[PDB]
Design a protein around this nucleic acid. Structure first.
Lengths: 94, 97, 109, 79, 24, 97, 80, 109, 94
DNA sequence: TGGAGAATCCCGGTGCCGAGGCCGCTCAATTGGTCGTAGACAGCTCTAGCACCGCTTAAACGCACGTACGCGCTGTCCCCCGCGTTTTAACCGCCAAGGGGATTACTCCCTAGTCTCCAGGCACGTGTCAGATATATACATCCTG
DNA sequence: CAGGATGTATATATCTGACACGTGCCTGGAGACTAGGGAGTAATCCCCTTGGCGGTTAAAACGCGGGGGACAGCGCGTACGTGCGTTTAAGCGGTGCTAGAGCTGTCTACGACCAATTGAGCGGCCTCGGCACCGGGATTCTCCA
């Protein structure tokens, strides 16, 4: 037998911390999983291309930050960069 | 009683934009997909979700094409959509070149 | 003895799987090596975007007097917002329908 | 054979209604079903070749999703 | 006949481009 | 006196500029425009000449494509002159707005 | 720098329209094209500057512009 | 002692480099490992496509009474071909100009 | 001293074996180089995605075959497949 | 249906600078072996696809009337075009300073890899509540007189 | 502007099946350690970017005269909308057969890795002829009498 992984638990946790009284359907969860996978693939591919262009062999935070700035538009890019930088700082402070 | 032409069309637009179900009958679309596919490989089998995904994508594409076509038809001082408008929308979108 | 295990997601304060994201980056053949801080940043970005979409979808669902988010609510939230609609312009959401709009020319006099 | 007639006139009419169209000319239906056939051929060719690569005989929904994504029309809801 | 000096290695009848003609 | 009937020397201009490959925007004002726009994103930037050249080539190619599209939009409306509404319709159908 | 969009003169827009096959031009097309070109240039130069900032250099190279154009669906041949 | 080297391009009868394509496939981070027959197939496809485009461009240059191919000739060759144009629909060629086309409505009558 | 790689030698050999009395400009050699790199990247990326989809970890001729069938339109693909298969068969024959 | 003139096309002489071929050489592909494992193949399973049959009835099909929209014709006048003049600044050529792209050395510290340990998330069961459905409304909307 | 007909939003009661939770468990994520080379920092070279000046002149701005066309209006007639009645085949259910998708177990031929070797292709550097340009003549096309 084999198991399949998904982001259902994390999407549900985020939803419950955003809208405590609101549930989410199975089809909506599938769409959110597809969205998360798509955004992950976009950012990861852009970061890989950025690493290849500069002849770096590593994907670091700055590569991900530059990717996020490249795909995400405007205010989304600004807020996402802020959130990522805050998370990285908190992680490295441990 | 007799509604003047146009009002029923407007209420149909307000209905089908509000609702979210599929608009093409399921079985003829299944048969169309199957007969189109047999030109590539014979005796092919289709997962039900595959046919459903094909129908969803086809209806979304047709609805977007009809939006662009209505924009083109209105641009020409008309309200009646015509095949010329479909051709213009397809070419400007880049699907005819 | 080994210390108590603390998930890297818990260290960063996120809800998304930093470990799983690190594995996916490492195994997905994106680069020869993946830095330590890349999964944290990517997980934070993904969680932020998901939080935005879920917040807008929940607002739309409340406007519809419903408790469960359905794909129609996701479509409404994504298309109504100007930034998400640009981020997901070439994305089709199954069972999402279309935004209700009618060209002003066609409305009756 | 002859199954493009299954995309009947009222079906295209209500697809146009969802698209926002007020009234429709009679020559639209044939053009619309021709366009639909072209799109279906374009997508199904890539789907079936995806299945050929995997040595399969069932066109799974993942193949259709991959074909749509590579055509620039990514689909959310099926994988 | 189109070919290469290594035959039919190239397609011997390339398709001509068409362009859209609006109006009449 | 001798004067060409309006339209003919407009057609000759079309044939003159569809045959050549030269740039149609003067180089110095375009370079100044590029530098002025780039001053918004980062100060004291330096541009390689090839960078400005590539920006100009891409910009005029995009403008030429847009002008073909708006010409088609204008002709579809049964008129010859192109108006800003035609450009807006072309951009909307192209998906740029 | 200031008001350099006026350097995209009316004759230049007219010639670009002539290359596009346009026979007759309205008077507002010039301002409309000024706006469209400004938007396009802003979008491309934003990504070019992002690339040149990530590379940690002050000189916007040709490859940065090529990469910026490629990722927007406007692949350009000739410089890289 | 060992036998004289025979390049894999010579072995396959191609002109494009099999070894360089193999290295680019391996170092390009496309997959964990690359099969021995992959570079040969890729080089053959690239050689065929270049031969096609250069043949059409040479024909176009001969139509202009020029013995050197310039980007204008490449542009003419690529756009005059339906399938090649479909392949390079989104590609812009610098110094290429446009295909001469005037809408039949604009022409005098 | 650094070295910059290009397909100029091979492109010129192909040109001289398809148009023996025709040259090429450097500004056109650059465009041919860019086209070769673009098509290489397209085919290799499609092959990588095909390998990932099927959970394989090797890029073989089958992956490139399917990538060619997916990318090149119509008779272009029909002829590229034949050229590739013939080249691979000749290579294995040695 | 003919000439005038304006533009285009065509032919010949000349200079040049960009393409083509040649000469080191170096570093990257080739050859020869080895080893680990990813993929090929046999075998088994049981899930999901295909096929069939009967009923209900929602939806498509066919038809008639007329009315509102498409299309053609007409008038205008004002906007755009073609051409002459003049004022502007792009363009080319040359000089000069130096900011910063590009490369080399070196080391250290960050990542890969391994082993061990354990809990987070996956699969399976499940019982209730959110949502779909039926029906009687009071209500808003369209239309004609 | 008012009344009739009719979609339509609303509230209540009903059903039901999808989901949010709980349990068991296993496998992948975390902790601790070592090894190694990727890249971060320092230093230097010199490339090419920016700034400036002067002269030519090609192009941009400006203005004027007039005509082709964009827009509004009128009229006509087809054709598409709306509603009614009559097929029809889609949808739903139920069942049965089995094709092949997926999983598991072996096993081998295939690709990575390493060391020695050498020639393929890059860098520089000629040299000359393809072509870009100028001058002049021939042909074509558009316009008006």
């Amino acid at each position: 037998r084999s198991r399949k992984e998904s982001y259902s638990v994390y999407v549900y946790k985020v939803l419950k911390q955003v809208h405590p009284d609101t549930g989410i359907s199975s089809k909506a969860m599938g769409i959110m999983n597809s969205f998360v996978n798509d955004i992950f693939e976009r950012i990861a591919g852009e970061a890989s291309r950025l690493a290849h262009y500069n002849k770096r062999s590593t994907i670091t935070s700055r590569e991900i930050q530059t990717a996020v700035r490249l795909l995400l538009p405007g205010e989304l890019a600004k807020h996402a960069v802020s959130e990522g930088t805050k998370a990285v700082t908190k992680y490295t402070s441990s | 009683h007799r509604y003047r032409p146009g009002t029923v069309a407007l209420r149909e637009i307000r209905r089908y934009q509000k609702s979210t179900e599929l608009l093409i009958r399921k079985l003829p679309f299944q048969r169309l997909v199957r007969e189109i596919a047999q030109d590539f490989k014979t005796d092919l089998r289709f997962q039900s979700s595959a046919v459903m995904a094909l129908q969803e994508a086809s209806e979304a594409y047709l609805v977007g094409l009809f939006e662009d076509t209505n924009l083109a038809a209105i641009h020409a001082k008309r309200v009646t959509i015509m095949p010329k408008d479909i051709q213009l929308a397809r070419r400007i979108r880049g699907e005819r070149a | 003895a080994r210390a108590k295990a603390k998930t890297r997601s818990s260290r960063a304060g996120l809800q998304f799987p930093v470990g799983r994201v690190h594995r996916l980056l490492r195994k997905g053949n994106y680069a020869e090596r993946v830095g330590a801080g890349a999964p944290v940043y990517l997980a934070a970005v993904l969680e932020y975007l998901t939080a935005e979409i879920l917040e807008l979808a929940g607002n739309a669902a409340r406007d519809n007097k419903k408790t469960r988010i359905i794909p129609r609510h996701l479509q409404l939230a994504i298309r109504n917002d100007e930034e998400l609609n640009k981020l997901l312009g070439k994305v089709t959401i199954a069972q999402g329908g279309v935004l209700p709009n009618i060209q002003a020319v066609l409305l009756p006099k | 054979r002859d199954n493009i007639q299954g995309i009947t006139k009222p079906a295209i009419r209500r697809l146009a209604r969802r698209g926002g169209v007020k009234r429709i000319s009679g020559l639209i239906y044939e053009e619309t079903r021709g366009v639909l056939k072209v799109f279906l051929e374009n997508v199904i060719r890539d789907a079936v070749t995806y299945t050929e690569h995997a040595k399969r005989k069932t066109v799974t929904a993942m193949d259709v999703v991959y074909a749509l994504k590579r055509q620039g029309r990514t689909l959310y809801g099926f994988g | 006949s189109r070919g290469r000096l290594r035959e039919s290695s190239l397609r011997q009848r390339p398709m001509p481009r068409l362009t859209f003609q609006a109006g009449d």
